[PDB]
Design an enzyme around this catalytic site. Structure first.
Site, PDB file in Angstrom:
ATOM      1  N   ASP A 156       0.816  -1.220   0.000  1.00 48.26           N
ATOM      2  CA  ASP A 156       0.000   0.000   0.000  1.00 48.26           C
ATOM      3  C   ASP A 156       0.852   1.274   0.000  1.00 48.26           C
ATOM      4  O   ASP A 156       1.729   1.424  -0.859  1.00 48.26           O
ATOM      5  CB  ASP A 156      -1.003  -0.008   1.149  1.00 48.26           C
ATOM      6  CG  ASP A 156      -2.011   1.105   1.036  1.00 48.26           C
ATOM      7  OD1 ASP A 156      -2.857   1.052   0.111  1.00 48.26           O
ATOM      8  OD2 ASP A 156      -1.929   2.053   1.857  1.00 48.26           O
TER       9      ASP A 156
ATOM     10  N   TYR B 247      -1.539  11.117   1.736  1.00 49.52           N
ATOM     11  CA  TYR B 247      -2.379  11.357   0.548  1.00 49.52           C
ATOM     12  C   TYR B 247      -2.391  12.841   0.186  1.00 49.52           C
ATOM     13  O   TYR B 247      -2.494  13.212  -0.983  1.00 49.52           O
ATOM     14  CB  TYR B 247      -3.813  10.936   0.818  1.00 49.52           C
ATOM     15  CG  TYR B 247      -4.033   9.453   1.018  1.00 49.52           C
ATOM     16  CD1 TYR B 247      -4.281   8.619  -0.064  1.00 49.52           C
ATOM     17  CD2 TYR B 247      -4.017   8.896   2.292  1.00 49.52           C
ATOM     18  CE1 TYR B 247      -4.503   7.260   0.115  1.00 49.52           C
ATOM     19  CE2 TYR B 247      -4.250   7.540   2.482  1.00 49.52           C
ATOM     20  CZ  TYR B 247      -4.489   6.731   1.390  1.00 49.52           C
ATOM     21  OH  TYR B 247      -4.708   5.380   1.575  1.00 49.52           O
TER      22      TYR B 247
ATOM     23  N   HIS C 253      -7.401  -6.645  -0.521  1.00 52.31           N
ATOM     24  CA  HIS C 253      -6.282  -5.707  -0.407  1.00 52.31           C
ATOM     25  C   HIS C 253      -5.162  -6.130   0.567  1.00 52.31           C
ATOM     26  O   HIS C 253      -3.965  -6.003   0.248  1.00 52.31           O
ATOM     27  CB  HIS C 253      -6.828  -4.311  -0.051  1.00 52.31           C
ATOM     28  CG  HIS C 253      -5.774  -3.297   0.239  1.00 52.31           C
ATOM     29  ND1 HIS C 253      -4.992  -2.729  -0.748  1.00 52.31           N
ATOM     30  CD2 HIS C 253      -5.372  -2.736   1.407  1.00 52.31           C
ATOM     31  CE1 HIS C 253      -4.155  -1.864  -0.199  1.00 52.31           C
ATOM     32  NE2 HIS C 253      -4.368  -1.848   1.108  1.00 52.31           N
TER      33      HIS C 253
ATOM     34  N   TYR D 141     -12.386   8.328  -2.552  1.00 53.92           N
ATOM     35  CA  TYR D 141     -11.758   8.399  -1.231  1.00 53.92           C
ATOM     36  C   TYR D 141     -10.530   9.317  -1.162  1.00 53.92           C
ATOM     37  O   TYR D 141     -10.436  10.123  -0.237  1.00 53.92           O
ATOM     38  CB  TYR D 141     -11.505   7.013  -0.594  1.00 53.92           C
ATOM     39  CG  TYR D 141     -10.298   6.255  -1.094  1.00 53.92           C
ATOM     40  CD1 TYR D 141     -10.318   5.626  -2.330  1.00 53.92           C
ATOM     41  CD2 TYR D 141      -9.152   6.134  -0.308  1.00 53.92           C
ATOM     42  CE1 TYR D 141      -9.225   4.921  -2.788  1.00 53.92           C
ATOM     43  CE2 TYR D 141      -8.047   5.417  -0.755  1.00 53.92           C
ATOM     44  CZ  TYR D 141      -8.093   4.818  -1.995  1.00 53.92           C
ATOM     45  OH  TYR D 141      -7.016   4.102  -2.461  1.00 53.92           O
TER      46      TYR D 141
END
Length: 318
Positions: free
Chosen positions: A101, A232, A297, A150
């Protein structure tokens, strides 16, 4: 677990919690969102016992690692800055790199900046994020999925944090960890709601125990989500700052592994990039791409044994 050595080191001006076990060439594990060093628990035990030094830090902002207050302290250069310093403390010139990730995005930056320090890379879930000169990372995602996607919803400071607070830390972690639904996560407007998982099971899937969840909760109820969310928030800034590497190749040996139901694999045209030819074009020594059937995931946790062995076999070739 009981033999895993925890300690706090100083790297790149911060205090970082490091978990390690074993001796041998270093296998450095980089977890993603919203996880902790704990996510690598099965890999730590496994590769430890096959003559490798398993090192798994909590990344900047996570767990028992220091979390700088400023959003700008979470660019990929800061994180890689932490990791290069950590790799110097371990005392080795090269490492084996295993990442997942967000940890994998960091791992790609690390291979971009210091290919010389990485012997071979086992990349889980997130392949190289190809830098499109024509449009910024989050711009491309908004254009394709709109404002409730998201990652667009993660951008505005304080907002996702407040929404997550309303449903609760435990619900958010259970919500995210238990998701098996493919496709781009699109949120309901103005709230978390059902977030990533409109189908939460009463019981946890068998790869995740109530104690496991409680460890995640114990950390997140204290640190909150801001540090992890700030990664992010630097995606467009990362894109701007990585111009020097536009059009560049990564010559490091890679093994790419994904669950077939991973939201990543099943959004952003990643399946085309992965198998179609773009990924190999960018990553000349990408070896056998591995798709795990019926796994979502969190595959290092859900397919822990398969992952453990895929890691070993790949690293042993070197």
């Amino acid at each position: 677990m009981e033999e895993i050595e925890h300690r706090t080191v100083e790297v790149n001006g911060i205090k970082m919690h490091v978990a390690e076990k074993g001796e041998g060439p270093v296998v450095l594990f980089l977890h993603g969102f919203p996880e902790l060093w704990y996510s690598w628990r099965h890999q730590i035990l496994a590769l430890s016992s096959r003559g490798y030094r398993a090192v798994a830090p909590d990344l900047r902002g996570y767990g028992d690692t220091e979390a700088p207050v400023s959003i700008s302290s979470y660019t990929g250069f800061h994180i890689v800055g932490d990791l290069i310093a950590l790799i110097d403390l371990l005392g080795v010139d090269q490492v084996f790199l295993v990442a997942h990730d967000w940890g994998a995005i960091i791992g790609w930056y690390l291979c971009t900046f210091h290919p010389d320090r990485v012997k071979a890379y086992v990349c889980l879930s997130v392949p190289l994020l190809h830098r499109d000169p024509n449009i910024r990372t989050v711009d491309a995602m908004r254009a394709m999925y709109g404002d409730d996607y998201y990652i667009c919803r993660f951008q505005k400071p304080g907002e996702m944090e407040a929404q997550m607070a309303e449903v609760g830390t435990e619900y958010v972690l259970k919500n995210i960890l238990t998701t098996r639904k493919p496709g781009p996560p699109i949120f309901p407007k103005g709230e978390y709601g059902t977030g990533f998982n409109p189908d939460m099971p009463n019981s946890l899937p068998s790869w995740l125990t109530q104690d496991d969840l409680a460890y995640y909760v114990s950390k997140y109820e204290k640190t909150g989500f801001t540090g992890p969310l700030n990664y992010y928030r630097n995606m467009n800034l990362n894109w701007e700052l990585t111009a020097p590497w536009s059009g560049g190749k990564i010559q490091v040996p890679v093994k790419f592994i994904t669950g077939e139901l991973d939201v990543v694999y099943t959004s952003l045209n990643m399946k085309e990039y992965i198998h179609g030819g773009g990924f190999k074009q960018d990553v000349p020594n990408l070896e056998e791409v591995i798709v795990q059937k019926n796994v979502a995931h969190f595959n290092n946790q859900e397919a822990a044994e398969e992952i453990n062995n895929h890691i070993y076999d790949f690293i042993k070739k070197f």
